[PDB]
Design a protein around this ligand. Structure first.
Ligand SMILES: [Mg+2]
Ligand SMILES: [Mg+2]
Ligand SMILES: [Mg+2]
Ligand SMILES: [Mg+2]
Ligand SMILES: [Mg+2]
Ligand SMILES: [Mg+2]
Ligand SMILES: [Mg+2]
Ligand SMILES: [Mg+2]
Ligand SMILES: [Mg+2]
Ligand SMILES: [Mg+2]
Ligand SMILES: [Mg+2]
Ligand SMILES: [Mg+2]
Ligand SMILES: [Mg+2]
Ligand SMILES: [Mg+2]
Ligand SMILES: [Mg+2]
Ligand SMILES: [Mg+2]
Ligand SMILES: [Mg+2]
Ligand SMILES: [Mg+2]
Ligand SMILES: [Mg+2]
Ligand SMILES: [Mg+2]
Ligand SMILES: [Mg+2]
Ligand SMILES: [Mg+2]
Ligand SMILES: [Mg+2]
Ligand SMILES: [Mg+2]
Ligand SMILES: [Mg+2]
Ligand SMILES: [Mg+2]
Ligand SMILES: [Mg+2]
Ligand SMILES: [Mg+2]
Ligand SMILES: [Mg+2]
Ligand SMILES: [Mg+2]
Ligand SMILES: [Mg+2]
Ligand SMILES: [Mg+2]
Ligand SMILES: [Mg+2]
Ligand SMILES: [Mg+2]
Ligand SMILES: [Mg+2]
Ligand SMILES: [Mg+2]
Ligand SMILES: [Mg+2]
Ligand SMILES: [Mg+2]
Ligand SMILES: [Mg+2]
Ligand SMILES: [Mg+2]
Ligand SMILES: [Mg+2]
Ligand SMILES: [Mg+2]
Ligand SMILES: [Mg+2]
Ligand SMILES: [Mg+2]
Lengths: 53, 124, 147, 124, 53, 210
RNA sequence: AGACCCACUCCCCGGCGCCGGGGGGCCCAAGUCCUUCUGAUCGAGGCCCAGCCCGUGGACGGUGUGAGGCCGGUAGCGGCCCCCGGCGCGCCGGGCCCGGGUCUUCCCGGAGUCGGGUUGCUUGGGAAUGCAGCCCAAAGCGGGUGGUAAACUCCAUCUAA
RNA sequence: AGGGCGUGAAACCGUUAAGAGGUAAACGGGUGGGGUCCGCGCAGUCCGCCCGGAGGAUUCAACCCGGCGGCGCGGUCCGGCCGUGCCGGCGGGGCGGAUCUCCCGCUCCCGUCGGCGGGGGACCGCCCCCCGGCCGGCGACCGGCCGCCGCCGGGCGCAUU
RNA sequence: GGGCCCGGGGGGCCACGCGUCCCCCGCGAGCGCACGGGGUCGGCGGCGAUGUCGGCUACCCACCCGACCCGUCUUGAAACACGGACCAAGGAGUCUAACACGUGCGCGAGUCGGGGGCUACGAAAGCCGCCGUGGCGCAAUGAAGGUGAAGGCCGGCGGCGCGCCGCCGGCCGAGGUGGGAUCCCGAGGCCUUCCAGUCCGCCGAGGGCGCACCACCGGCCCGUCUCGCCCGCCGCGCCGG
RNA sequence: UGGAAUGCGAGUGCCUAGUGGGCCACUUUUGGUAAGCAGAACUGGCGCUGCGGGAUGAACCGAACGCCGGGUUAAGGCGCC
RNA sequence: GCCGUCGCUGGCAGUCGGCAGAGCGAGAAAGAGAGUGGCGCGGACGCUACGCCGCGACGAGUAGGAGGGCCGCUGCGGUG
């Protein structure tokens, strides 16, 4: 959880443009499928429209 | 890691089939289509896959290389083997035991290979 | 969610979990806090002593801004200034003590809980407790009053 | 609390272990060199421990360093240090019960007249 | 991890609860493997009781 | 009916509260509308500042807030008079006026007087007739740089006078903070009765004297 | 208002002519290509390397299923045509003959209302928060308020009818 | 699908077929007999190795060429990125600081001397970028040579394989 | 009878090397049968394509044993207790607010932007930080005025007569007793031809540091009471500590 | 020499529903001529509970219940049903 | 015999293979320890660890509580 390799940048022709970017730290952050499901569950309720008889 | 990735997909995967009190995995390089940590074909650094060749003759043995783990384009080495039945199995046994490449999948790979070759014989 | 609640498991069970004998009637015992000095006296006496009666003077038109007086103890006193403020003062030699102005931090009175590090300090506040001033004086500091 | 319990005689160079969170204490002035294993350490507690020269571990690192837990000092936070336990015990309206009542407000008018002073009915 | 977020007023990456998630490397490591008792993998099924008399 | 230990609750739902529920489902649509009226107003008065007239500094009342300053309603007539701005001309050039407000102390008066003079120094004034400048108007060179201002004009901020470490004296070390406070409360509490006793005492002895 | 200084020419009204958001109408990409299932199909297969064609348009509806490409539409700081509006620029006839600082002398306020008693309602407003009836009924450094009735006394704060 | 016409349930009814019928019917357990259908049964499984007969071939092992891959404590190969590592930096900078500190705007005082507000600079903590030294990963992170092994393609092996 | 059934002059022993000292007088190899860690046969027979084989359950019928009609109130229902002729569709613990405890997640002496603002799905999502005002938490206590959360030791002086109180300077320091998961030391001890003595491990009498928690005893803060002697001063007080 | 036998792992904290009509039997027992009456104690039951026996039956006797095969019983029985 | 529940808070990461050596159920503490001197290329299944395996006990139920439903219904985000 400390490796930050170099990521290629590809040209529009689908080839490695020779440039590189170090992998951002955010891609090493903990993967929490339950924090995601909690957050997705509750945020998706926020674009609802009320219904009532 | 494999164990971390297995905890994300053990019960949430497009390849997961739950039906008739059974469970299967339809992803490539799973030797038994089994929703198992051992036989999952995506989460490990070293995986073995056996498929029928594009034409119904011989099998294709897929091995995951060690370097390009994050590079899907060049991660799998595919070898076609179209010898007789006993020679096809002998190659797979050596491709696994001699290289010490996931030795715990030796018989699953050999059992899967015998099943593809059998299915390529003329039907009666 | 309603799928996780008792109602779903109570389908098919007559009485819906309220009993066959006592049933679920509308308001047995009264509505709200009825019966405090009556059929509900034990609960009130047992769990809410002091509930009934009157105590103390009335004060019409209380304005809670007049008694605003946030307090800070001495054990938290040095957090009101940065860390380098304390280390610089502790290691300097001229004997100069830093000024901690608790009003700037949103406090008025200084209380005495805790102990101070052996480091002189000048404290500014509207109010002090007697033990706060002694403890502040025990480390070589002084208390400064502001209006 | 961790500094106090790790200062008892004969606990030098022992790794403090807590299955939980290590929170910072602003009331502490000097932080000694600690080795700690915790589930979580607050952002400010982490800086203070390291700036003092200590070492922070995870529990997967305690195993590779102390597989059997040797040289460890297992520690726990105050379990009764919660507001709820101020409400447990003899009901507030019984003799010598120092239980905290459940009131919506605190002040002269809120449960202090009858049952709490002899001048109003009684006290216990 | 070393540098707080620049475009968020006060934010930093969430800390890892488990730094090495490779459970197989941990378990197979020499250090843990020295502390273990030998496995007891022999199965002792039920013995049918025969009458000694 | 109460059940074991529990708070005694007095919900205020004994009226027809359902007839007067105010939902907030129009909140995002209100926020858009308010913003759209801020933009059309900013375009309408440009290059005048979108925020509005410059407000003064004032100290919040009560002892809970008097350590803080904020934006007041408008500058007072004494402030404008000392700053040489006509009260009726003040509103025309972006300055707010508050005839009600009184200046009790000089320092607060001066702070707003200086605030006005700083504002008058930043004012870029366009001539009434664009082709016919006049006495007070800004030069044509600095009109090409006149751009609308966003946010409150000269925002008001609470600044603290930092004091450096100084060696504590024996006079300060000797000061008694608690005793000084307790005696001060006593003196301000017994002042009226003490003065009464002194007056009566003189009367009692005087009749003995004369 | 008078005096001494200082500074002033654009501000609007009725007409008249010229110049740069809103409503209505009409329009603007691409398969009905080749086999094929069907009562009919919008279905299925295909459409060279490349990948049928358009795509800022793959919302939706219609059409004998199930349609980006058959039609209407959809996208577009797209096109054209009418009308209303707004914002600017000039002319005619009008109105205004306009301001600031300091001194000097002057002038300045809402009454059957306030306030008081009592009654009824009302309020969280408690020796009475507000309102109303009846009685009493003002003052002018006065009057109102200053959340406990009242006298004496300072303060603060506004200026009702 | 025949104009209250999509589908067309249940109750209830007509008829056809089968079975049965004096303790109302119905029901549980246990068999039995008869039907409707199903096995799309009716000379009964399949697989590995071995032995033997008949044959038949993109003929085996071993060798050579080429490609690919795994591993190497290559006891210490070269090149690399690279340490949420540690040391030395005249290193070139950002962030923060209730750590200190020549320039300026306004103001009190006589052209002088002070206060507020606005700016450098030093300092400290952290971070990024540059250079040298140790150990250090490359299993969330690789290339070149060498070695071993494995696999495939092509030769050669032409037959007790 | 008991004394490995004491000692002396035909029938069963889970007796069977020896140097010795002397009480007394550390590995043989095979093979095989089995009352031996739960069943096998390395045993057989008949029938089989147009009327026969298998088909639990399922349709109809029969017989034997069993068998009162449900829901409900009720001590007690098959009841001569009430609802129920039959079939379809509909039909009853919800939502809002408040509170309590439990659980999960985030951050943590803090935490929360919910109101406001900025920048098709989107009325969403993202940002604010001199938007954290504010809420809850971080301090209690008293009707209130108000007050508001450890000490000891050393040296000197002062008052009383070695001890006490008031005052000055240096040292240590957030209590203790009992139990207490875990952790720590380690008498002794864990074998291979035999002796010595090492490296890593491991068991362990006894002894320690002792988490949380509980019981107990101290202490500290606010209200009240009783007793009592002092200390401060710009205000010498019906003052303050 | 953990200082009688026997048996058994204990302690502890929160939240908590339904109930708050009961009725019956051995023994003891109050009122009443008595009652399948009214009222108590102890234990056990029925209520909430099927099952073998008492022909039949809330409580009696035996015994308490996962779906089964074999064996043996209890209380009760063995002319025929 | 079989089903389930409960308990053993039981066992399995040791699939440690020709870079090899198969064990730790056994009456009675702790090492199948490490040293220094005196031909073939072969070896079943397993491990959705929320999984798999073993052993022992047990199983009445109204009011009521709790758990699990790969029980069923309608719509929404993903996926097939
Ligand atoms: Mg039930
Ligand atoms: Mg009911
Ligand atoms: Mg209930
Ligand atoms: Mg009830
Ligand atoms: Mg209710
Ligand atoms: Mg209740
Ligand atoms: Mg259509
Ligand atoms: Mg097509
Ligand atoms: Mg369409
Ligand atoms: Mg198409
Ligand atoms: Mg079109
Ligand atoms: Mg359009
Ligand atoms: Mg008026
Ligand atoms: Mg009324
Ligand atoms: Mg009322
Ligand atoms: Mg008053
Ligand atoms: Mg039809
Ligand atoms: Mg139709
Ligand atoms: Mg119809
Ligand atoms: Mg019809
Ligand atoms: Mg019919
Ligand atoms: Mg018939
Ligand atoms: Mg019968
Ligand atoms: Mg019958
Ligand atoms: Mg009923
Ligand atoms: Mg009855
Ligand atoms: Mg019934
Ligand atoms: Mg009857
Ligand atoms: Mg009835
Ligand atoms: Mg009826
Ligand atoms: Mg229905
Ligand atoms: Mg409750
Ligand atoms: Mg909670
Ligand atoms: Mg929308
Ligand atoms: Mg009742
Ligand atoms: Mg009775
Ligand atoms: Mg009775
Ligand atoms: Mg009942
Ligand atoms: Mg019972
Ligand atoms: Mg029973
Ligand atoms: Mg009988
Ligand atoms: Mg039986
Ligand atoms: Mg009989
Ligand atoms: Mg049960």
């Amino acid at each position: 959880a400390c490796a930050r390799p170099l990521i290629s940048v590809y040209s529009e022709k689908g080839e490695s443009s020779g440039k590189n970017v170090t992998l951002p730290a955010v891609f090493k952050a903990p993967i929490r499928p339950d924090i995601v499901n909690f957050v997705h569950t509750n945020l998706r309720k926020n674009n609802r429209q009320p219904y009532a008889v | 890691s494999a164990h971390l990735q297995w905890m994300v997909v053990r019960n949430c995967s497009s390849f997961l089939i739950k039906r008739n009190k059974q469970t299967y995995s339809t992803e490539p390089n799973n030797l038994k289509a089994r929703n198992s940590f051992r036989y999952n074909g995506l989460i490990h650094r070293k995986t073995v896959g056996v498929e029928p060749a594009a034409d119904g003759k011989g099998v294709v043995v897929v091995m995951k290389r060690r370097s390009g783990q994050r590079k899907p384009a060049t991660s799998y080495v595919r070898t076609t083997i179209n010898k007789n039945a006993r020679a096809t199995l002998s190659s797979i046994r050596h491709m696994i035991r001699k290289n010490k490449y996931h030795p715990d999948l030796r018989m699953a790979a050999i059992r899967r290979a015998s099943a593809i070759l059998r299915s390529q014989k003329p039907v009666m | 969610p309603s799928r996780l609640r008792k109602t779903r498991k109570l389908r098919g069970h007559v009485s819906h979990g309220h009993g066959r004998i006592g049933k679920h009637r509308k308001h047995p015992g009264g509505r709200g806090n009825a019966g405090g000095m009556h059929h509900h006296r034990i609960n009130f006496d047992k769990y809410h002593p002091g509930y009934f009666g009157k105590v103390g003077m009335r004060h019409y038109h209380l304005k809670r801004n007049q008694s605003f007086c946030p307090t800070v103890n001495l054990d938290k006193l040095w957090t009101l200034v940065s860390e380098q403020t304390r280390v610089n003062a502790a290691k300097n030699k001229t004997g100069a003590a830093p000024i901690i102005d608790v009003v700037r931090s949103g406090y008025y009175k200084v209380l005495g809980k805790g102990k101070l590090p052996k480091q002189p300090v000048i404290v500014k506040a509207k109010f002090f407790s007697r033990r706060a001033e002694e403890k502040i004086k025990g480390v070589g500091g002084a208390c400064v009053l502001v209006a | 609390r961790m500094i106090r319990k790790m200062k008892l005689p004969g606990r030098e160079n022992k790794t403090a272990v807590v299955v939980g969170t290590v929170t910072d204490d602003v009331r502490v002035q000097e932080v000694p060199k600690l080795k700690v294993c915790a589930l979580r350490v607050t952002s400010r507690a982490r800086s203070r421990i390291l700036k003092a020269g200590g070492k922070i571990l995870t529990f997967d690192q305690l195993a590779l360093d102390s597989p059997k837990g040797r040289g460890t000092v297992l520690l726990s936070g105050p379990r009764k240090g919660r507001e709820v336990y101020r409400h447990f015990g003899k009901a507030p309206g019984t003799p010598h019960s120092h239980t905290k009542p459940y009131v919506r407000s605190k002040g002269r008018k809120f449960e202090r007249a009858r049952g709490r002073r002899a001048s109003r009915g009684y006290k216990n | 991890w070393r540098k707080a977020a620049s475009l968020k007023s006060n934010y930093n990456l969430p800390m890892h609860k488990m730094l090495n998630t490779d459970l197989s490397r941990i378990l197979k490591s020499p250090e843990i493997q020295r502390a273990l008792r030998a496995p007891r993998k022999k199965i002792h099924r039920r013995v049918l009781k025969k009458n000694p008399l | 009916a109460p059940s074991r230990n529990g708070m005694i609750l007095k919900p205020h739902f004994h009226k027809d509260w359902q007839r007067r529920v105010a939902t907030w489902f129009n909140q995002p649509a209100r926020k858009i509308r308010r913003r759209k009226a801020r933009q059309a107003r900013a375009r309408r008065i440009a290059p005048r500042p979108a925020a509005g007239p410059i407000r003064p500094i004032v100290r919040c009342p009560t002892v809970r807030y008097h350590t803080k300053v904020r934006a007041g309603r408008g500058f007072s007539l004494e402030e404008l008079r000392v700053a040489g701005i006509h009260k009726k001309v003040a509103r025309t050039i972006g300055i707010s006026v508050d005839p009600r407000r009184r200046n009790k102390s000089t320092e607060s008066l001066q702070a707003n007087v200086q605030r006005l003079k700083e504002y008058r120094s930043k004012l870029v004034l366009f001539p009434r007739k664009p082709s016919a400048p006049k006495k007070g108007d800004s030069s044509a060179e600095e009109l090409k740089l006149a751009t609308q201002l966003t946010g409150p004009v000269m925002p008001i901020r609470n600044v603290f006078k930092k004091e450096k470490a100084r060696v504590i004296t024996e006079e300060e070390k000797n000061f008694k903070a608690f005793a000084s406070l307790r005696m001060a409360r006593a003196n301000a509490r017994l002042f009226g009765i003490r003065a009464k006793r002194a007056k009566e005492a003189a009367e009692q002895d005087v009749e003995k004297k004369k």
